[model samples]
Target chain A: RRIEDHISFLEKFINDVNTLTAKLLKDLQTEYGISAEQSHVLNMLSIEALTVGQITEKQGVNKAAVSRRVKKLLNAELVKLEKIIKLSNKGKKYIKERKAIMSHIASDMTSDFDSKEIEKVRQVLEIIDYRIQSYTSKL
Target chain B: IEDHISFLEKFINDVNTLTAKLLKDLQTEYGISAEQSHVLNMLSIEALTVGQITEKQGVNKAAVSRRVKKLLNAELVKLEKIIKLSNKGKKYIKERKAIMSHIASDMTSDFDSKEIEKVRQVLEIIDYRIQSYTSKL
Candidate 1:
């Protein structure tokens, strides 16, 4: 039923960019002159204040890696620590400045990801997770 | 006409998030990314040309070049007119197989057969659209 074609299409489009995950992270580092991990930590926090674990949970990065990245961000003066967790004025300014770069990359995809797409994906992942738990309990 | 296709593109890209995660996970732990692993899979059985690998993977020639080059440098695969998987490549798939099976099983368990079939149907239509786009190119 042409399922092979579908599988073929998905796998090709996917593997092509498989290295891109790290490549893009490195791009952020080179462009911003920050470490990749620190760049990820700062870029995520630019949106809002969050704990290190939150970054790990959402991104699938390990907790230890996230912790180390956060430590680096703090050390670099990219983020300022505060009550209720604020983007350091420096980090806030960096994010505001670099918003162009993030969206540019998102838009550049043969497969794109954006807030609209991400929200839908988030729902899909959540539903899959929820259904797995519910179904598992029944078994 | 080309409406919901965007959803598929985004979904596939989102799916790449999973693929990308696997790569960094391996690269950090073992100096190999999951995509690097995919290139190995194509070579593991026997020597293969770029044609077979590209068709099998749905990746493009340029990307195949980039992908295979990195893998070759890592010694996971070698090319002599055709790419061949290395000893490491064979061992990797052997180990990687058990892990990927559970991931597929988990997804299958999460969604009903009816639901997966529906998405596949949608993906099939999207595949048709892609053919047209390919034809134009």
Candidate 2:
């Protein structure tokens, strides 16, 4: 029962986190024509230009899907479609503001928790994530 | 958002994404679609009416109806007054549960029972807040 409760809590946590993320990203899409996933690509491009294949490998998703996102970003003028996808100045500005909004929203949601509580929360989450990653890789 | 909260959201979202992919992998390997897998998982606990499953799953009635129909076609579920897993359904879900238990055991191995309890409480609190906040949105 203890382990069942733990698994159920973790499953619920995953769903709740996704719910909040989708709501936030929907707001982002309303304001700017980007999604949570596209924002992830832009965030990656902030550091360095990456080819579609590279993005596919890093994202752990399909190549066709990554190419579609790269195409969308290119169409939006957010990314320069070269040999490798690069963020334009506009893309840089957009992702910066996106990060700020994400930061703001995260702060508001977590306003009740103190630094110590937050640290423990992060630690446990990381541990869960590490184990999940390890478990899934074998499957 | 503060740096901590911002980092937390990104970290959790990535974890969620991994789970999503994991579900996709399961669908590919087990021949059970995510929606069907979800319904099977819930039904494994007890028989449930369509309305009950719809509300619990946070999906629409039409979607739930379609999934149940598909499962019925597959002979994985029996529909009397309420929907329940058939013998075949029980066998299928048992195998799935074994796979899932492996992951749970791996996670539990890393932490003290008390530590796991504390983490569960922290997540419950934050999960409630997130649910409340999203409801307002």
Candidate 3:
């Protein structure tokens, strides 16, 4: 019964968190022209240029949607598509710049929180993850 | 009337700015796009099929499917063929729940402190009202 209660509590907690996370991401997307997926793709491309198939594999998205987004990035000159096979130098540079911008934003966002509070949140999340992993493994 | 119109205009502008700034920050901090993140969050609770995700998210299946594929690619999640769950699958679901919880907790922590507190308070009150309203239903 105790385990069942714990499971229910965890489930509610997780659901609430997921909703909040989506809200935050939406907030960011509305403010910036960049979507989260686009940023993610750029970040992935920064490490190495990959074909549509590769990106599809990496992101777990469909080939067509990934293709369309890649095209949009190319048009924005945030990324360069080469031979429909890889990212170009321009794409790499844009992703690098974007990463720096993101780092700045993250630093700014957390600036208000005390180190202890931030660490506490991190620790709690880790605990939750551990519990979840244990539960999933039993299935 | 003119003053009222001016105030409304300014309000709209403020909303736009706030949205833009938030999105920009999210993009830089989290590699996942907003749509993709939405899909991830939804899936974090239990493994939803493509159709379920579309309905829950109020998005097209194609879009959700695409995002799910992206998530799968990122190794952030795995798609299981739904057979009857053994103990192992249940455990997997629990772990995914934790990931979702962790992500939410982290985000709530990151929200503007005053704003978040206000929102939570409002939501609590609203929830009470909802419960009362739905009791007859």
Q: Pick the candidate with the highest lDDT.
A: 2
Deviation in angstroms for A78 in model 1? 1.6
Chain B only, TM-score of each candidate: 0.57, 0.66, 0.43
Give the per-residue lDDT of model 2 (tens digit) for A1-139: 4576676666666656655655666666546677556877887787567887666755466547677878888888888976567888778888677667667766776677776887887787777767766754764
State which docking tier applies to candidate 3. incorrect
lDDT of 3: 0.47
lDDT per residue as tens, model 1, A19-64:
3333433444555567544655675565457775556654554446
The C-alpha stretches of model 1 lying farther than 4 A from their native spots are A1-31, A44-72, A83-86, A93-123, A129-139, B1-84, B110-114, B117-137
lDDT for B53 in candidate 1 is 65
Q: How high is each candidate's TM-score?
A: 0.45, 0.68, 0.35
TM-score (chain B) of candidate 2: 0.66
Number of the top TM-score candidate:
2
Judge the docking of candidate 1 as incorrect, acceptable, medium or high.
incorrect
Which has the greatest DockQ?
A: 2
Q: Flag the better candidate by TM-score, 2 or 3.
A: 2
Query: What is candidate 1's fraction of native contacts?
Result: 0.03
The recovered share of true contacts, given per candidate in order, is: 0.03, 0.38, 0.01
Stretch of 10 with least lDDT, candidate 2 chain B: B13-22
